C-alpha cells in the first residue's frame, strides 16, 4: 500500500517541493470529496475570526514620547476611519469587487491553512466611490512557479527569485487558468517596496530554514481516504453476503463406477445417454415446477452444486480499530472528533471543560500566529494610504517620521471571535473575581469579553441616566 | 526485526555520532509522514512560548550597589526599547528577512527539540530601517560537519574544533544545499568572541560529558512506525478476508480406480476421453448458465476445488496491545496521549487536575531549561548593541563595567505562555488565598498571571477615576 504514496528520505522542503503538484492535487481531491476539511476550515474560521476581526491601534507612545491621551484620540480617529472604510456594503474593497474585509481574512486564512501560504497584493484601484484608492487582490498559489514552469534553479526556486542567502526578492506569477484554456505567462512581482511599503504580502509558516512553501493536508489524510474506502467496501460485502444462497439440485444417482463408465461412453460414442438424461431432467423440472419462493430455482440437472464454504468468522474488529484511529488522527490534525463528528460517548464534566479550554487556548495560538500577520500588513498599507491622504493627523511631536517608524506608529493588535461561552458559572466566577481584585485591565478585560471599555462606560452612563429619567433603578 | 535498526554497546555519544545521518534521516521521515511530531512540537510551542516570550531585565542592583529604583527605571527604558525593536512588522529582524523574534524562538526551540541543538549567529545587518544593526541568522545543523565531510578526528570532531580538554573553539559550516545542487564548502566560525560577545550561540543539552550533539526522536519512534504498519496491514487483511468466497464446481463422478485408469489411459494414448468430458462440461456450463449472483461462477470442470481452511480464530488482542503501548510511549515521549489523540475514556476529576498540573509544571521545566538560554543570549547581544549605540543609559555608579559584568548587568528572566486555565475554582481560590495572606509577591504574582503589577496598578487607577467621572462604581 506504500506503493501509491512515497516519502523520500531528505529535508522536508526538498522532500515536498518535487512532489508538490501531486500532494496538493490529492489534497484538493480529498477536501472536495470529503466533509472533514470543510468542517475543519469552518471551525477554524469561527474560532479565529468568528464574527469579525477588530483593529486596535496602539502607537508606541511611551517609546516615541507621544502622550497616551493623544495616542488614544488618534487611535479613535483611525478606528472610526477604518471601520467606516471596511463596512463598505458593495463588496468594493477588492479588485475582484466581490469580497469585503471579512472574506479577505476568510480566503487568506483558508489558503494559508491549506497550502500554508497566502498571497495578498496591494493594488491601486481607480474606483472613486471611496476616499482610499488602495485595494488588496489575493493571488493564487498556482501562479507561483518558475518562469514557464521550469524546474527549480540556483536562485529561481519554485517561482521565487532569491539570493544565495535566501532573501526573497520577487516572484513569477503565472497567468490565471480560468477558463481552463488560458495559457500561463509569468510576471515579475517584488515582495515589498524598498521604502517598507507592503506590496506583495507573502505570509507563510516555514517549518525550517530556506523553506518557501507551507504545510499540506493530504500527506496525512491518505489514510482516512483508504480507511473510509475499506470500511465502506467491507460493510457492502458483509451486507450482501449475510444471506447469499445457492439454489442448485442434486440427486442420488451417482453410481460411482457406473456413472463414470456412462460418462466415458458418452464422451466416446454414447452421447444419447446424456441427451436422454437431460431430456428426462428437463421433463422433471417442467412437470415438478421446481420453485423455491417467489422465484424459480436456477436450472441445475443433478450432480453439480456450488461449495460456498466460507473463510474465518471472527468479529471484524473494525469497531475498536476505527475508534482508536479516529481518536488517533483527531488529536493528530488537532480538532477533536468528539465534535468533528460529535460523539457523546461517556464524556464527563472535567472532560468537557478541560478539552474545551485547552482547545480554545490552542485556537488562540493559531489565531495569534496566522491572523496577526495579515492584519498588521493590511493595517500598515491602509495607514500609509491614510497618511498620504491626510485623513488622520499624526502627532506633532513625532520622535520618528511615519516612514521611519511605520512599525512603531502602525503598532496594532486585533480581536478575533466573540465572547466565549462554555459553562456560564466558570466565566461569571472568573469575572467576579477579576472585578473584585482588580486583576483585570481595560485591554485584557476587553480581550476576554469582546467589547470596549470606553463604550461600556459611555453606555453605562446612558443606562443610569435613562433609568433615572424614566424612573427605573440604575 | 532488530535487523533494520541496530544499537552498538558503547557510550551514547560514540553510539549515536557514527549513525547520526541515518537516525536523523529516518527522524525526518517520521516527522514528515506522521502527525504526532507536528502535534508534539505545536504543544511544546504553545506551552513554552505560547503567545509571546516576554523579557524582564533585573540587573543585580544589590550586588552592584545600584539603587533598585534606578535599576527599575533603566529596566523600563530597556523594556520599551526591546519591545519596540521586537515588534517590527516587516519581519526584518532576521538576515533571511522573513522571521520576527517569535519565529526566532519558534525555529530555535523546534530544532533544539528535534536535533537537541540550536545554532544562532549574531550578524551585522546593514539595513538602516532600524537603529540596531544586529540581526540573528539561524544556522542549519547539516552545516556542522568536519571540513569536507571527513570523519571525526583528534580535535576536529563532527565539525567542531575543540582542544584535548574539549573546549569548543569553533565550527566548520558546510555550504547550504538548497537548491539540491549546491556543493558544500566548510567555513570557520568561532563559538564566541574573546570579549564575551555571543557570536555563535550554540545551545544544546549534553546528556554526558564531551557530547557534542543533542537528543533524537526516531531512535524511540521506530516502534510506532512498525506498529502503525502492522495494525494497518492486519486491519486490511481482516477486512478483505471476512467474506472471501471460493466458487468452484465439484461433481459425484470420481469412481476411484475407474477415474485413475481413465486418467492414466488419457496420459498414455486416450486423451479423447478427456476432450469429450471437457466438451460435455463446457456444454454443461453453457446450457446451465452456472451463475451464482450478479457474477459468473469461475469456470471449474468437476474434480478440483480450493481448500480455504483457515488458521487460528482467537481475538487478535491488538486492542489491549495498542492501548497498553500507547499508554506506554505516551508518558514515554512525555506528553500524554489522552490529548495527543484525546481519549475521554473513564477519565475523572483528580485524573484531570493531577495530570494537568504535573504536565504543566513539567513544561515549565522544559521552558526554563531550553528557552532561557536563547533568551539570555539574544538579550545580551541586543543589550551590548544598545550600550554601543547609547540607547539606554547605564547607572553612573557602576561597580563593574558593562563589558566586565555583562552577566550582572544583563541579568534577565523571561515569561512564556499566558495565564493557565484548567478549572477556574482552583486558580481563583489560590488567588484569593495569596491576596489575603500576602503569600504572593509582584514578581511571582505576575509570573502566575502573565501580567505586570505596574500596569495593573496604573490601569486600576484609570479604572477608578473613569468610574468616578462617568458615574460608575469603583
Amino acid at each position: 500500500q506504500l506503493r501509491s504514496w512515497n516519502p523520500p528520505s531528505e529535508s522536508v522542503d526538498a522532500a515536498l517541493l518535487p512532489n508538490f503538484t501531486r500532494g496538493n492535487a490529492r489534497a484538493d481531491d480529498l477536501v472536495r470529496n470529503n466533509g472533514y476539511a470543510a468542517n475543519a476550515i469552518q471551525l477554524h474560521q469561527d474560532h479565529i475570526v468568528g464574527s469579525f476581526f477588530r483593529l486596535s491601534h496602539r502607537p508606541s507612545w511611551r517609546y516615541l514620547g507621544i502622550g497616551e491621551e493623544e495616542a488614544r484620540a488618534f487611535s479613535r480617529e483611525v478606528e472610526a476611519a477604518w471601520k467606516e472604510f471596511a463596512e463598505d456594503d458593495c463588496c468594493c474593497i477588492d479588485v475582484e469587487r466581490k469580497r469585503t474585509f471579512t472574506m479577505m481574512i476568510r480566503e487568506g486564512v483558508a489558503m494559508h491553512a491549506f497550502n500554508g501560504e497566502l498571497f495578498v497584493q496591494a493594488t491601486w484601484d481607480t474606483s472613486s466611490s471611496r476616499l482610499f484608492r488602495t485595494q488588496f487582490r489575493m493571488v493564487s498559489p498556482k501562479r507561483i512557479s518558475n518562469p514557464n514552469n521550469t524546474g527549480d534553479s540556483r536562485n529561481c526556486r519554485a517561482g521565487v527569485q532569491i539570493n544565495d542567502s535566501g532573501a526573497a526578492l520577487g516572484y513569477y506569477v503565472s497567468e490565471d487558468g480560468y477558463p481552463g484554456w488560458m495559457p500561463q505567462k509569468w510576471t515579475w512581482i517584488p515582495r515589498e517596496l524598498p521604502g517598507g511599503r507592503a506590496s506583495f504580502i507573502h505570509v507563510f509558516e516555514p517549518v525550517e530554514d530556506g523553506q518557501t512553501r507551507g504545510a499540506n493536508v493530504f500527506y496525512s489524510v491518505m489514510e482516512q481516504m483508504k480507511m473510509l474506502d475499506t470500511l465502506q467496501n467491507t460493510q457492502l460485502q458483509s451486507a450482501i453476503v449475510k444471506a447469499m444462497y445457492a439454489a442448485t439440485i442434486e440427486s442420488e444417482l451417482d453410481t460411482q463406477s457406473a456413472m463414470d463408465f456412462i460418462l466415458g461412453a458418452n464422451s466416446q460414442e454414447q452421447r444419447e445417454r446424456l441427451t436422454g438424461w437431460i431430456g428426462e431432467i428437463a421433463a422433471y423440472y417442467a412437470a415438478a415446477p421446481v420453485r423455491l419462493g417467489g422465484a424459480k430455482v436456477p436450472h441445475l440437472m443433478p450432480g453439480d452444486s456450488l461449495n460456498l464454504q466460507t473463510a474465518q468468522d471472527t468479529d471484524n474488529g473494525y469497531s475498536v480499530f476505527e475508534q482508536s484511529l479516529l481518536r488517533y488522527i483527531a488529536a493528530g490534525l488537532g480538532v477533536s472528533y468528539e465534535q468533528l463528528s460529535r460523539n457523546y460517548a461517556q464524556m464527563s464534566y472535567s472532560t468537557a471543560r478541560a478539552s474545551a479550554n485547552e482547545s480554545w487556548a490552542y485556537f488562540m495560538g493559531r489565531r495569534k500566529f496566522v491572523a496577526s500577520r495579515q492584519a498588521s500588513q493590511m493595517f500598515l498599507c491602509w495607514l500609509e494610504e491614510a497618511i498620504v491622504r491626510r485623513v488622520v493627523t499624526l502627532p506633532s511631536k513625532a520622535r520618528f517620521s511615519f516612514q521611519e517608524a511605520r512599525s512603531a506608529w502602525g503598532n496594532c493588535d486585533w480581536i478575533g471571535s466573540g465572547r466565549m461561552a462554555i459553562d456560564g458559572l466558570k466565566e461569571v466566577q472568573e469575572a467576579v473575581m477579576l472585578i473584585e481584585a482588580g486583576l483585570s485591565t481595560y485591554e485584557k478585560e476587553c480581550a476576554k469579553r469582546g467589547d470596549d471599555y470606553q463604550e461600556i462606560f459611555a453606555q453605562q452612563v446612558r443606562e443610569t441616566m435613562e433609568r433615572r429619567a424614566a424612573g427605573l433603578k440604575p | 526485526q532488530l535487523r533494520s535498526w541496530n544499537p552498538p554497546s558503547e557510550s551514547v555519544d560514540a553510539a549515536l555520532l557514527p549513525n547520526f545521518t541515518r537516525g536523523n534521516a529516518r527522524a525526518d521521515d517520521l516527522v514528515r509522514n506522521n502527525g504526532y511530531a507536528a502535534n508534539a512540537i505545536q504543544l511544546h510551542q504553545d506551552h513554552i512560548v505560547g503567545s509571546f516570550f516576554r523579557l524582564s531585565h533585573r540587573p543585580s542592583w544589590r550586588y552592584l550597589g545600584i539603587g533598585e529604583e534606578e535599576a527599575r527605571a533603566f529596566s523600563r527604558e530597556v523594556e520599551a526599547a526591546w519591545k519596540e525593536f521586537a515588534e517590527d512588522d516587516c519581519c526584518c529582524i532576521d538576515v533571511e528577512r522573513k522571521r520576527t523574534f517569535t519565529m526566532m524562538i519558534r525555529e530555535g526551540v523546534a530544532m533544539h527539540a528535534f536535533n537537541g541543538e540550536l545554532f544562532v549567529q549574531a550578524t551585522w545587518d546593514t539595513s538602516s530601517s532600524r537603529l540596531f544593526r544586529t540581526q540573528f541568522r539561524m544556522v542549519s545543523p547539516k552545516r556542522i560537519s568536519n571540513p569536507n565531510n571527513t570523519g571525526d578526528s583528534r580535535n576536529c570532531r563532527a565539525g567542531v574544533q575543540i582542544n584535548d580538554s574539549g573546549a569548543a573553539l569553533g565550527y566548520y559550516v558546510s555550504e547550504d544545499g538548497y537548491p539540491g545542487w549546491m556543493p558544500q564548502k566548510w567555513t570557520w566560525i568561532p563559538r564566541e568572541l574573546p570579549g564575551g560577545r555571543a557570536s555563535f550561540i550554540h545551545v544544546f543539552e549534553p546528556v554526558e560529558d564531551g557530547q557534542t550533539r543533542g537528543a533524537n526522536v526516531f531512535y524511540s519512534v521506530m516502534e510506532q512506525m512498525k506498529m502503525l504498519d502492522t495494525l494497518q496491514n492486519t486491519q486490511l487483511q481482516s477486512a478483505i478476508v471476512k467474506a472471501m468466497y471460493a466458487a468452484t464446481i465439484e461433481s459425484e463422478l470420481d469412481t476411484q480406480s475407474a477415474m485413475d485408469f481413465i486418467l492414466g489411459a488419457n496420459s498414455q494414448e486416450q486423451r479423447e476421453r478427456l476432450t469429450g468430458w471437457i466438451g460435455e462440461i463446457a456444454a454443461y456450463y453453457a446450457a446451465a448458465p452456472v451463475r451464482l449472483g450478479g457474477a459468473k461462477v469461475p469456470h471449474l470442470m468437476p474434480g478440483d476445488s480450493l481448500n480455504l481452511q483457515t488458521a487460528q480464530d482467537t481475538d487478535n488482542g491488538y486492542s489491549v496491545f495498542e492501548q497498553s503501548l500507547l499508554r506506554y510511549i505516551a508518558a514515554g515521549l512525555g506528553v500524554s496521549y489522552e490529548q495527543l489523540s484525546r481519549n475521554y475514556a473513564q477519565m475523572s476529576y483528580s485524573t484531570a487536575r493531577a495530570s494537568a498540573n504535573e504536565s504543566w509544571a513539567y513544561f515549565m521545566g522544559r521552558r526554563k531549561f531550553v528557552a532561557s538560554r536563547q533568551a539570555s543570549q539574544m538579550f545580551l547581544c541586543w543589550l551590548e548593541e544598545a550600550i554601543v549605540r547609547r540607547v539606554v543609559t547605564l547607572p553612573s555608579k557602576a561597580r563593574f563595567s558593562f563589558q566586565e559584568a555583562r552577566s550582572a548587568w544583563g541579568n534577565c528572566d523571561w515569561i512564556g505562555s499566558g495565564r493557565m486555565a484548567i478549572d477556574g475554582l482552583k486558580e481563583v481560590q489560590e488567588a484569593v488565598m495569596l491576596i489575603e495572606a500576602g503569600l504572593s509577591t509582584y514578581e511571582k504574582e505576575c509570573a502566575k498571571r502573565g501580567d505586570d503589577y505596574q500596569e495593573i496598578f496604573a490601569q486600576q487607577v484609570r479604572e477608578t477615576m473613569e468610574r468616578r467621572a462617568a458615574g460608575l462604581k469603583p
Partner: protein, 335 residues
C-alpha cells in the same frame, strides 16, 4: 549503499536507433514478449451500417508471441581506493572526501553501465535491421533466434549480377539501384546511411558527386541529431531528394575494438519505422515489492556482508527490442 534516487543522468545519447526508429517501449510485468498482447498495428478499416454497430475489436492476436528478453544485469565495484576522473580543478578536497568520491564514482560506474546496455542494445538493433534475425544468446543460455521476418527481397545483394566496384567509376549512376532496392521496401526511404567504405564506393561514381548537394538545406531534425551525436553519425549532405549519412560507430569488446557495421551494408527504409522495445520482468526482490517489475532499467547500491564483504552498484534490465515491419528495410550487402 546509496538510495535508488541517486540515479540522475539526463544523458540519453543513443545513436539514432533506439530514439528514432525504436521509440515504441513496452515494459511488461511478465517474463517474455507476447506480440499477441501488443496491439501493434490495429485492424483499421471497417465500419458498420447506419442502423446498428458491429462486434468487439481486439488486439489482433499476433501469431508468434513468445521470445526471451535479454535480461542483462551487470554490476561493478565503487570501492573508494581509486583516484577518479577529476574534472579540471573543481576543488579536489571533495574528492578527498570518501562521500563525494563514492557518490560521483557510483555516478561514473552506473553511467558506464547504461552505456554498456545501450551499446549491446545497438548491436541488437544493427543485427535486427540488417538481417531481421537477432541472436538471443549467451553462455549458460540457449541461443534463441528472434526473427521479425525479413523477406528475401529485403536481403537482395549488390554483388549479385553487376557490382558497383565492377562498374564505370565515372558515368554509372547507382541511383537506379537506389530506387530498385527502395521500391520493395514498403515505403519511402529518406536516409541512405552507409558504413564508411560503402559510402566510399557509392561516392566514387561521379554522377553521385555532382548529384549530391553538400549544402545544409536543413530538411528535418536530423541535422540537430547529428549536432547532438557528433561522434559516429556523419551527415554527409543532401543527395538532392534523399539525405546521405554515414555511421562509423565502434564497440570495444573484451580485448579489442571494432566497428558495429559490417564491411559494406545498407538498409533502405523510413525514419519513422515502428520499433518495439518490449521489456521483460526485472528479477530483483526490491523491484517486485516496489512495483518496478514493469520498467526500463533498475539501479541499486548495496553492501555485501560476509565473504565478499564489499559494496557494489548493480544495474538490471531486460530488453528485447525488435522491428514491427522487417519488410520496411531492404538490407543489401554492397560491392
Amino acid at each position: 549503499a546509496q538510495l535508488l534516487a541517486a540515479n540522475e543522468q539526463k544523458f540519453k545519447f543513443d545513436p539514432l536507433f533506439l530514439r528514432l526508429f525504436f521509440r515504441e517501449s513496452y515494459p511488461f510485468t511478465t517474463e517474455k514478449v507476447y506480440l499477441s498482447q501488443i496491439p501493434g498495428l490495429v485492424n483499421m478499416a471497417l465500419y458498420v451500417s447506419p442502423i446498428v454497430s458491429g462486434e468487439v475489436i481486439r488486439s489482433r492476436g499476433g501469431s508468434t508471441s513468445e521470445f526471451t528478453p535479454g535480461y542483462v544485469k551487470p554490476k561493478h565495484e565503487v570501492n573508494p581506493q581509486m583516484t577518479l576522473r577529476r574534472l579540471p580543478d573543481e576543488d579536489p578536497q571533495n574528492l578527498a572526501d570518501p562521500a563525494y568520491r563514492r557518490r560521483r564514482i557510483i555516478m561514473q560506474n552506473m553511467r558506464d553501465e547504461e552505456l554498456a546496455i545501450a551499446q549491446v542494445e545497438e548491436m541488437q538493433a544493427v543485427s535486427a535491421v540488417l538481417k531481421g534475425k537477432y541472436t538471443m544468446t549467451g553462455e549458460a543460455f540457449d541461443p534463441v533466434e528472434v526473427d521479425m521476418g525479413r523477406s528475401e527481397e529485403n536481403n537482395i545483394t549488390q554483388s549479385g549480377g553487376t557490382e558497383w566496384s565492377k562498374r564505370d567509376k565515372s558515368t554509372y549512376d547507382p541511383t537506379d539501384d537506389i530506387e530498385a532496392y527502395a521500391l520493395n521496401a514498403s515505403g519511402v526511404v529518406n536516409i541512405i546511411v552507409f558504413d564508411p567504405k560503402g559510402w566510399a564506393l557509392f561516392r566514387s561514381f561521379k554522377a553521385v558527386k555532382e548529384k549530391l548537394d553538400t549544402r545544409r538545406g536543413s530538411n528535418s531534425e536530423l541535422e540537430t541529431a547529428v549536432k547532438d551525436l557528433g561522434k559516429a553519425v556523419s551527415y554527409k549532405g543532401m543527395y538532392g531528394d534523399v539525405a546521405i549519412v554515414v555511421y562509423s560507430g565502434q564497440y570495444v569488446e573484451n580485448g579489442v575494438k571494432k566497428n558495429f557495421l559490417p564491411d559494406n551494408t545498407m538498409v533502405l527504409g523510413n525514419t519513422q519505422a515502428r520499433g518495439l522495445r518490449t521489456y521483460g520482468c526485472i528479477q530483483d526482490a526490491d523491484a517486485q515489492r516496489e512495483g518496478i517489475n514493469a520498467s526500463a532499467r533498475y539501479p541499486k547500491n548495496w553492501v555485501t556482508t560476509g565473504d565478499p564483504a564489499r559494496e557494489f552498484t548493480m544495474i538490471q534490465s531486460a530488453p528485447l527490442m525488435l522491428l514491427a515491419d522487417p519488410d520496411e528495410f531492404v538490407s543489401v550487402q554492397l560491392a
